[PDB]
């Protein structure tokens, strides 16, 4: 939902006010900042009243900027949680106050209840019409309709739900476009998919990840040494004749402790979970996402699918005398039964070229043939036409089986498509071929370049296909995978997982979830494809909504991006304190030891201006690093040492250098404004 | 001057490396549990006679063994110091020590700190100096090397639950490393002008007719293990400036080599036991770079010494105040940095008479954790804690869960690493704060201005970091000062030894994965510079305000 839009920024500035200590003591660094802010505000009120002599305006400005720092730290977490919950609120925008219709008999034509009751128990029978909303998750008893799964996929695409097979599984939040279905209720409200996604977006940082725990341990230790130095600085400076003012002490304490990473840690975690959920990968917690960054080998899965999912439809090619609209309609109608990402991408190309959208099921009287691994086909028999879609050799065997011969007009087209390298698919309708379609690569750099980058980063890639060795070698050569496994059994898969886990590696595997359940249980990071959500998310093995075998690449990249964002902002927060010392120490000891003005390498105006500039920079660096925490770090896939060198050059030297420039320009603004 | 200093540093590092390579191999053999050649059989019957036998025990029993031996030695030394006038070898009829002085001396000699708040030559008898203090000089060094042996064994072993026999480790270390090397060093010192007699104090007819009472006693035997174990507990009030302890430049060079012998050999042994010598070379390169930079800075600050000497009518401006004339200002600066970074209390020059800039870097090397060639393992595990912090930061910076030598690091190990990092600056800061809020702590002061606070900070850093080098102008013989310093040494030893052994017990039970292309290389110039940067940066962000109120203010003035 863009970056910082005013329709939600103000709505979460209403929610920044978590300033009560009951919601602040869970974060120790900002509870320290909150305690220091309260102390400085109380002593500034005392100074203004006349309890002790002092400026009573510089201290008030210091307290106000400390409160502004706490507000900015809460604002980062508020933006992260709002961006996490925005898509769930949009899902609940059509779910709340919706027309839910419930029947009285399981058959069609029965009396219907016009009451939107959300207390539907097991065995409850509901019916929906065209342009309606499903009440909850369930199984379709009978019927056939075009359902748009946009509410849970994030992109609009029609699917077919019908009785029989694996197509009798419809969820709640998605709308129904074309026809009527009757649905038996399968789960109680409370464990449904929409409630589980709501609990995902509101159950942020309930179970803290071990990386966040250890980083919190580091931040607590840094806060402890900084608090010890700042607190013991008062008896050290009392020997010089006059003591350091405690407002200066609290300001130096807040400027020293890592408030940047200390305020942006929860923002990093929630934004990383939002990036996970925006890629249509659903995990119970961030522990598996972080463990995906620790893996040394990736085990892919392309049984039941064509290619690795990186190739998707881009263009439609008529053969001869065939309308492109008719060819796209036939391909879309054949790819309704194809749940594989290529079969979905045919529908995306058809709707982006002609906007077919809604179809009709009962008037067609069509029987759907689901996609199978052994046939590599996805067809549909509408009345009598044998509409089928599959690979070129599969269609060649199909026309060798039937009486119609394969025409020789499309040999030039299939050779041309192979010449640009896209894999070709052929649609056949009874005995004729109306066109050959191309599946262009989606990755801009190339899937071979992506796998080479992952090999450079130290993660091996293993592609399991369950096919012949002639096809497997070609698929591995076109994809760029390091090694391939063919004719795979679950026992051999488990043996491969164990022998890769034995030699000091962590194995991440995608799979079906039901057909690959022991392998996914043995693997440390598990992703399920084409799996039932209610019977999958309770067991684990993180749900992939697109069923794309290459989603593990994005999961690994997002987890590593989270880890690198945390490390880079920790390095920035630690490195800022050198310039914080160079700004505050001559300002703090300007009267106790007046010879200490030689350490003022920056030509700052007054000690009050220097301390105020340091506090203003500490407040403003959090806002200046909100976009970096929300979007992650723009990391380049290289080796480990080269990545460490590049990140050190960007962030450690940056946090060494730019606080000097920031404090100097803030003091320049203060001098030209005349505040000091 | 600069060429002579560079030649001195280069030949010191060269002789140190070529001396500590075979001792590194021998210490690696001691870690790997293979007995030394020619020692088995005798070692077997000695272990059977002592009843230690084969007790392969875990980290809890190892830590209980170390703390039990340390408390037994503390009780024995405390009662010996209280009852030193009921014991033989007392020709001066010196009375028994007071309760505070005896407690402070016992804690400083058991916790390998060796703080001489008294004057030993007029405080201690020969039997006390020989049987409590030298024995604790052996025992604290053996305990530190046994703890770092346990840490190296924990990093080496795969999925075990035990850590080796602590008594076998202590007996092997003391019998085959600490005794014969110090015997050779002591006989070299007796070949030079050091003392190894037991005679009463010699009355001297001075040429002008005055009287001198030379303190003559078993000096070289205590001096050798003082230098070898990085103790720093001198026989006399002068720690190593006294000519009966350091009579020759050759004696001082052998002293410096003995000070850095055990840390360099322990790093070499670590690199040999884990099978990758680049891992030990990483630590050696980091310590050597920081050490060379600190020696050069202190050498320059001491060459450009007192600026008032030129105005007062002197041909030279070198800070020769509080420096022996047998040694150069360069040699005094080098010895200052060597013992001050190596957790050794020995001084050939008075550190209180140093320049402000030339005394800032010593107390900074103290306050960073005494990790630059520090201690007999006591700063090696501190460097290991800094390596754990550095691999945590670098693993997060590259995007992987952190691991050192293939062993993953988790919440418990990071908790104990953070606590062990936290223990000693906490002790420094609250001890100095308690000293500077009390007239009993501010009445021990001798120099006015910020140099007095520098004295207080140096003394509390000596107690907490187990160094024992003293800004000797402080009169730390008060009961309050003795109790505060004894508390600081006790916590700074046994609140760092305990979490290191807890990390050892948490790391024995982990598999070490094989290194891959994505595995972070923990050697090379990048990781050496990263370790140097994180040690320097942690020390700076902890101790810039104290140095600014002390030595920086004294420098600027």
């Amino acid at each position: 939902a863009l970056f910082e839009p005013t329709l939600v920024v103000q709505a979460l500035k209403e929610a920044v006010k978590k300033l009560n200590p009951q919601a602040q003591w869970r974060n120790p660094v900002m509870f320290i900042v909150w305690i220091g802010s309260l102390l400085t505000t109380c002593i500034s009120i005392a100074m203004a009243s006349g309890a002790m002599p002092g400026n009573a305006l510089f201290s008030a400005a210091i307290s106000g900027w400390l409160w502004i720092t706490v507000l900015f730290a809460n604002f980062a977490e508020a933006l992260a949680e709002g961006r996490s919950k925005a898509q769930a609120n949009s899902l609940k925008g059509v779910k709340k106050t919706a027309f839910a219709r419930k029947l009285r008999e399981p058959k069609y034509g029965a009396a219907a209840d016009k009451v939107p009751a959300d207390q539907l128990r097991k065995g409850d029978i509901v019916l929906v019409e065209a342009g309606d909303i499903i009440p909850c998750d369930g199984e379709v008893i009978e019927g056939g309709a075009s359902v748009d799964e946009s509410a849970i996929t994030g992109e609009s695409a029609p699917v077919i739900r019908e009785s029989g097979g694996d197509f009798a599984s419809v969820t709640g939040g998605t709308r129904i476009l074309s026809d009527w279905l009757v649905i038996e209720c399968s789960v109680n409200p409370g464990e449904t998919f929409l409630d589980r996604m709501i609990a995902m977006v509101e159950g942020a940082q309930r179970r803290k990840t071990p990386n966040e725990i250890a980083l919190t341990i580091l931040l607590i230790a840094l806060t402890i040494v900084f608090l010890l130095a700042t607190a013991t600085l008062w008896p050290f400076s009392a020997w010089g004749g006059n003591a350091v003012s405690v407002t200066v002490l609290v300001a130096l304490l807040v400027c020293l402790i890592p408030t940047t990473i200390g305020g942006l840690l929860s923002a990093i975690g929630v934004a990383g979970m939002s990036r996970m959920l925006g890629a249509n990968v659903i995990a119970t917690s961030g522990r598996a996402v972080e463990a995906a960054g620790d893996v040394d080998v990736l085990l892919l899965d392309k049984t039941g699918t064509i290619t690795l999912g990186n190739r998707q439809a881009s263009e439609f090619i008529p053969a001869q005398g065939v309308d492109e609209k008719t060819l796209a309609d036939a391909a879309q109608l054949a790819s309704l039964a194809d749940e594989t990402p290529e079969g979905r991408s045919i529908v995306i190309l058809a709707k982006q070229r002609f906007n077919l959208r809604e179809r009709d099921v009962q008037s067609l009287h069509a029987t759907f043939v689901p996609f199978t691994a052994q046939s590599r086909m996805s067809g549909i028999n509408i009345d009598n036409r044998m509409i089928r879609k599959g690979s070129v050799d599969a269609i060649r065997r199909h026309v060798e089986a039937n009486g119609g011969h394969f025409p020789t007009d499309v040999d030039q087209k299939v050779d041309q498509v192979a010449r640009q390298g896209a894999t070709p698919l052929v649609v056949v309708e009874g005995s004729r071929v109306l066109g050959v379609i191309a599946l262009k690569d989606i990755v801009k750099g190339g899937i071979k370049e992506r796998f080479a980058q992952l090999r450079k980063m130290g993660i091996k890639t293993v592609m399991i296909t369950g096919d012949n060795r002639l096809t497997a070698a070609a698929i591995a050569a076109e994809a760029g995978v390091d090694d391939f496994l063919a004719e795979a059994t679950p026992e051999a898969k488990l043996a491969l997982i164990r022998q890769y886990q034995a030699e000091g590696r962590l194995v991440a595997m995608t799979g079906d979830g039901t057909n690959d359940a022991p392998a996914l249980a043995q693997a440390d990071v598990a992703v399920a494809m084409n799996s039932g959500t209610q019977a999958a998310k309770e067991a684990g093995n993180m749900v992939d909504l697109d069923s794309n075998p290459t989603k593990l690449i994005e999961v690994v990249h997002i987890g590593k991006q989270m880890l690198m964002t945390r490390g880079s902002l920790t390095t920035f927060s630690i490195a800022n304190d050198v310039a914080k010392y160079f700004a505050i120490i001559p300002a703090a000891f300007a009267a106790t030891y007046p010879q200490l003005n030689a350490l003022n390498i920056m030509c700052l105006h007054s000690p009050d201006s220097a301390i105020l500039s340091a506090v203003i920079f500490n407040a403003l660096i959090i806002v200046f690093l909100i976009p970096l925490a929300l979007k992650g770090v723009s990391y380049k896939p290289l080796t480990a040492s080269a990545m460490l060198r590049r990140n050190l050059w960007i962030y450690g030297l940056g946090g060494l250098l730019v606080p000097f420039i920031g404090i100097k320009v803030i003091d320049l603004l203060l001098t030209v404004c005349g505040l000091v | 001057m600069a060429a002579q200093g560079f030649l001195l540093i280069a030949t010191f590092l060269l002789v140190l490396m070529v001396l500590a390579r075979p001792l590194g191999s021998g210490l690696a053999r001691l870690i790997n549990d293979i007995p030394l050649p020619g020692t088995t059989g005798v070692e077997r019957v000695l272990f059977r006679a002592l009843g230690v036998s084969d007790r392969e025990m875990n980290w809890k029993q190892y830590l209980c063994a170390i703390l039990g031996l340390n408390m037994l030695g503390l009780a024995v030394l405390f009662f010996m110091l209280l009852g030193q006038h009921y014991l033989p070898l007392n020709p001066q009829q010196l009375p028994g020590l007071s309760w505070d002085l005896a407690l402070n001396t016992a804690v400083s000699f058991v916790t390998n700190t060796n703080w001489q708040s008294y004057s030993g030559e007029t405080t201690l008898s020969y039997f006390s100096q020989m049987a409590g203090l030298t024995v604790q000089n052996f025992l604290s060094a053996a305990s530190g090397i046994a703890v770092i042996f346990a840490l190296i064994r924990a990093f080496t072993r795969q999925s075990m639950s035990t850590l080796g026999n602590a008594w076998v480790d202590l007996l092997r270390i003391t019998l085959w490393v600490l005794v014969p090397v110090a015997l050779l060093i002591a006989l070299f010192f007796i070949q030079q002008g050091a003392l190894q007699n037991f005679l009463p104090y010699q009355a001297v007819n001075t040429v002008e007719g005055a009287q001198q009472l030379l303190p003559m006693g078993p000096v070289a035997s205590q001096e050798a293990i003082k230098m070898l174990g990085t103790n720093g507990g001198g026989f006399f009030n002068a720690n190593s400036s006294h000519p009966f302890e350091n009579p020759t430049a050759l004696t001082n060079f052998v002293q410096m080599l003995a000070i850095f012998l055990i840390p360099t050999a322990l790093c070499f042994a670590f690199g040999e036991v884990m099978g990758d010598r680049r891992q030990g070379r990483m630590l050696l390169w980091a310590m050597s770079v920081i050490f060379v930079i600190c020696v050069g800075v202190v050498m320059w600050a001491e060459v450009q010494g007192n600026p008032h000497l030129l105005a007062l009518g002197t041909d030279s401006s070198i800070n020769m105040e509080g420096k022996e004339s047998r040694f150069g200002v360069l040699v005094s600066s080098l010895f200052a940095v060597v013992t001050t970074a190596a957790s050794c209390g020995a001084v050939i020059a008075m550190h209180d008479s140093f320049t402000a800039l030339g005394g800032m870097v010593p107390m900074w090397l103290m306050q960073i954790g005494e990790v630059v060639f520090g201690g007999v393992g006591s700063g090696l595990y501190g460097m290991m804690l800094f390596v754990l912090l550095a691999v945590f930061i670098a693993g997060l910076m590259i995007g992987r869960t952190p691991e050192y030598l293939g062993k993953k690091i988790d919440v418990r190990e990071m908790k104990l690493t953070a606590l062990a990092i936290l223990v000693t600056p906490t002790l420094v800061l609250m001890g100095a704060a308690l000293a500077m809020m009390t007239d009993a702590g501010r009445s021990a002061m001798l120099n006015p201005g910020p140099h007095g606070f520098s004295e207080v900070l140096y003394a509390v850093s000596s107690a907490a970091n187990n160094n024992g080098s003293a800004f000797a102008g402080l009169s730390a013989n008060s009961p309050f000062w003795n109790c505060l310093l004894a508390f600081c040494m006790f916590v700074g030893r046994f609140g760092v030894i305990i979490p290191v052994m807890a990390i050892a017990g948490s790391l024995v039970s982990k598999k070490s994965q094989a290194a891959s292309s994505g595995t972070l290389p923990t050697h090379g110039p990048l990781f050496v510079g990263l370790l140097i940067g994180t040690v320097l940066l942690v020390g700076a962000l902890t101790f810039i305000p104290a140095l600014a109120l002390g030595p920086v203010a004294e420098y600027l003035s």
Partner: peptide, 29 residues
């Protein structure tokens, strides 16, 4: 020594105790 000094000392003691408790119990924080 003084009322303000002793209140500052106890406040620093409670802050250090809270941070030490947070470091020991870091999963719950």
């Amino acid at each position: 020594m003084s009322a303000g000094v002793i209140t500052g000392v106890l406040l620093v003691f409670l802050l250090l105790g809270y941070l030490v408790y947070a470091l020991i119990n870091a999963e719950a924080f």
